[PDB]
């Protein structure tokens, strides 16, 4: 009944707009742009496909993606969904019925997929409509964890669900593989901010994994738990202050020598108009019994 009219589009212009480098953990994105002329024969229910590469997703830090409708003035020309291959299928409305000379433009942001692109390095991104494609080689740079003397830490936020008011934060503690004596981690709101995070025994769930080979760690902060050793039951998780958690890492010799992954599944306050603004602080001694801390801030604008 409906026809795939991809091949009948004309004047198809596809561009990937970015700089030389994309920094996913800075919430960097590329802009995907598509312009085309629609055939006069097009009717309601006709479709076309945008091919999106496996290196990209359309959701970014959010759990689900919503494809923007293609507009003709203040009317909807086409509605889009993401199929199971990650490609976008647009279906034309009755706007095209009894119209000629119809043209369209649509732009949407796209994000580097952390499961598909686990490491820093060049990737060639290709997108298209039919055999009309665009390609661009870009450096994907996840940059490095923070370090202060023998203390290292970094975290990233993903899986923000604004319907169910949830978020995920993945933290690497001691990714440098230093010796840290009497380590502790706290998770907090960033000072001098209206932050929408609810951190407490009800709202926060924490899993901890020991990393026996640091080469197994993704630079993208994609984590498959089965790759690591779940040690949740051997750490001590508490909530000593309002909107703060603490994790202690007791060991038989009072130090750690390996990285740990801390996976926080938390909640957002729907009453807040603030941003999701989190501070992770790692504490410990070095071998000269100097007590230090270092913090890592993650912030997602709402």
């Amino acid at each position: 009944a409906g026809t795939d009219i991809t091949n009948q589009l004309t004047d198809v212009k596809v561009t990937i707009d970015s700089g030389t480098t994309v920094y996913p953990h800075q919430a960097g994105y590329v802009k995907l742009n598509y312009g085309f002329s629609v055939p006069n024969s097009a009717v309601k229910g006709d479709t076309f496909k945008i091919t999106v590469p496996k290196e990209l997703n359309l959701n970014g830090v959010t759990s689900t993606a919503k494809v923007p409708p293609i507009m003709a003035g203040d009317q909807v020309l086409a509605n889009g969904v993401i199929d199971s291959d990650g490609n976008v299928i647009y279906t034309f409305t009755d706007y095209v019925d009894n119209k000629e000379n119809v043209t369209a433009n649509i732009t949407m942001p796209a994000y580097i997929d952390p499961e598909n692109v686990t490491k820093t390095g060049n990737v060639t991104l290709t997108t298209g409509i039919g055999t009309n494609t665009a390609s661009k080689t870009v450096l994907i740079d996840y940059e490095k964890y923070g370090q202060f003397h023998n203390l290292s830490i970094k975290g990233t936020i993903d899986q923000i669900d604004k319907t169910n008011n949830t978020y995920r934060q993945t933290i690497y503690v001691n990714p440098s593989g230093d010796n840290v004596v009497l380590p502790a981690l706290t998770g907090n709101l960033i000072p001098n901010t209206k932050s929408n995070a609810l951190i407490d025994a009800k709202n926060t769930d924490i899993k901890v994994y020991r990393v026996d080979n640091a080469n197994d760690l993704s630079e993208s902060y994609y984590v498959n738990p089965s790759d690591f050793e779940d040690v949740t039951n051997q750490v001590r998780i508490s909530f000593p202050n309002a909107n703060q958690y603490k994790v202690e890492f007791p060991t038989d010799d009072d130090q750690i020598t390996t990285p740990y992954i801390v996976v926080v599944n938390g909640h957002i306050d729907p009453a807040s108009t603030g941003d999701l603004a989190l501070r992770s602080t790692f504490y410990g001694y070095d071998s000269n019994f100097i007590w230090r801390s270092m913090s890592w801030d993650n912030e997602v604008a709402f």
Partner: antibody, heavy 123, light 108 residues
């Protein structure tokens, strides 16, 4: 918990001073321990620490002459100081070393101390 | 391993007098300052740790205060048995610096 130092009270110049600290009324395990010395009528000088697992840290000025070791089965740890001279004549103390950790926001202190044992370097 | 300056080198005070001993660090050491008492022919004994915490069993006439660079040991009412050399000790880093000591003599 009581600590007791033991070892020769007389050592010849250029040879090695050896002392042992015996822990009683408690266990040596899962703790840090230090050696600290005091020349007669002078102040205190920390020499180094050992954790019961065997890791150590020695004061930079003495590191090239110091060895500390532990035998947890005997509830004892030891100090060896090589290339001795009259400058090493002192009371030698062992002491349990506590770390303040998160609760105290850092720091460390020495408690309890042994009785001290005098070593004289002389020909 | 921070330079410390303990004052005074000695003092003489009567029983019941208030006595103050001070320690100055050359850079800030937060709360990382301990006090020891050394009686004649005895090892040092911990009196105060982490600036202000009193060791168990130590009389409450002994108090510690201060933060940053400047620390004070106070004896509110000097007693005969308090005769000793007192030492501060910073715990910012190993090797820890001990103060030069204060010899407390009792006037009678």
């Amino acid at each position: 918990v009581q600590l007791q130092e033991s070892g020769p009270g007389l050592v010849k110049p250029s040879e090695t001073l050896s002392l042992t600290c015996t822990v009683s009324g408690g266990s040596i395990n899962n703790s840090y321990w230090s050696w600290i010395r005091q020349p007669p009528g002078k102040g205190l000088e920390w020499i180094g620490y050992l954790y019961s697992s065997g890791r150590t840290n020695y004061t930079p000025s003495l590191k090239s002459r110091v060895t500390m070791s532990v035998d947890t089965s005997k509830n004892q740890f030891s100090l060896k100081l090589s290339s001795v001279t009259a400058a090493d004549t002192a009371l030698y103390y062992c002491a349990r070393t506590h770390l303040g950790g998160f609760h105290y926001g850092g720091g460390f202190w020495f408690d309890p101390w042994g009785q001290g044992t005098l070593v004289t370097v002389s020909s | 391993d921070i330079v410390m300056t303990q004052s005074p080198s000695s003092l003489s005070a009567s029983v019941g007098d208030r006595v103050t001993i001070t320690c100055r660090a050359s850079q800030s050491i937060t709360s990382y300052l301990n006090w020891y008492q050394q009686k004649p022919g005895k090892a040092p004994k911990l009196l105060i740790y982490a600036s202000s915490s009193l060791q168990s069993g130590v009389p409450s006439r002994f108090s510690g205060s201060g933060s940053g660079t400047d620390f004070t040991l106070t004896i509110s009412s000097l007693q005969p048995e308090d005769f000793a050399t007192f030492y501060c000790q910073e715990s910012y880093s190993t090797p820890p610096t001990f103060g030069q000591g204060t010899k407390v003599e009792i006037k009678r």
